[PDB]
Design a protein around this ligand. Structure first.
Ligand SMILES: C[C@H]1O[C@@H](O[C@H]2[C@@H](O)C[C@H](O[C@H]3[C@@H](O)C[C@H](O[C@H]4CC[C@@]5(C)[C@H](CC[C@@H]6[C@@H]5C[C@@H](O)[C@]5(C)[C@@H](C7=CC(=O)OC7)CC[C@]65O)C4)O[C@@H]3C)O[C@@H]2C)C[C@H](O)[C@@H]1O
Length: 215
């Protein structure tokens, strides 16, 4: 590929992200003022783990669907054999969900957008997995510190998915070729935007992988 083609890849990854990002960043930021009352919090805390599980599983499944749509629009992803498409989404979709969450997270008050309003980790109490929710909130907290642009998320999450080191891949060389082009697309766009500094500030490789493992 040439540099003009990599620019086309950047714009295309950024486009596919915008068309699949679930909620507009605009709306998410506007709603930061809209916070669950103490009574609303208590309403969530009173629900059984079973109701909370059902709701959360629904929102998660929905988010994963958007991730799958995003991957399907990535260049060459549809050209991969069905086995590798599945391998890559299985290992990487949840990781993408967790990176995308940071757009919906307000570090000023450690709250997250959930079912129309912002709420803290205590909203999820009935699930009885406070270590997990706190680790999910803390990861969003550290990502929010970097002020990820929409295009940085698009390109970074394309790379979370297109990773030739996933076990079980059958056409490893094809995935590699896609990965290298996306790596150069990312580096090149950071240089275009004077954002080279975020490279050293990214989650250490394995952090994201192990947070979704025990999940
Ligand atoms: C490990 C132990 O787990 C024990 O049960 C567990 C397991 O079954 C696992 C089970 O997973 C939950 C849990 O992970 C929490 C999880 O909670 C979900 C809802 C809350 C989330 C914080 C979270 C992460 C994505 C995040 C949502 C909130 C949404 O509004 C978003 C902000 C939304 C938006 C994005 C955007 O850009 O705009 C809006 C899309 C998704 C979103 O990014 C997923 O929902 C999942 C279903 O939690 C149970 C308690 C049993 C044993 O003790 C076992 O040994």
């Amino acid at each position: 590929a040439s540099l003009t083609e990599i620019e086309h890849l950047v714009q295309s990854v950024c486009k596919s992200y915008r068309e699949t990002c679930q909620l507009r960043l605009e709306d998410l930021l506007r709603q930061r003022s809209n916070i669950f009352s103490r009574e609303e919090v208590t309403g969530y805390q009173r629900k059984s783990m079973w109701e909370m599980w059902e709701r959360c599983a629904h929102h998660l499944t929905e988010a994963i669907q958007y991730v799958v749509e995003f991957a399907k629009r990535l260049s060459g992803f549809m050209e991969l054999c069905q086995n590798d498409q599945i391998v890559l989404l299985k290992a990487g979709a949840m990781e993408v969900v967790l990176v995308r969450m940071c757009r919906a997270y307000n570090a000023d008050n450690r709250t997250v957008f959930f079912e129309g309003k912002y709420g803290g980790m205590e909203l999820f109490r009935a699930l009885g997995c406070s270590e997990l929710i706190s680790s999910i909130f803390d990861f969003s907290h550290s990502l929010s510190a970097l002020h990820f642009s929409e295009d940085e998320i698009a390109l970074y999450t394309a790379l979370v998915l297109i990773n030739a080191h996933r076990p079980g891949l059958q056409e490893k060389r094809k995935v590699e070729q896609l990965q290298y082009n996306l790596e150069l697309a990312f580096h090149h766009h950071l240089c275009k935007t004077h954002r080279q500094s975020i490279l050293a500030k990214l989650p250490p490789k394995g952090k994201l992988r192990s947070l979704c493992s025990q999940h």
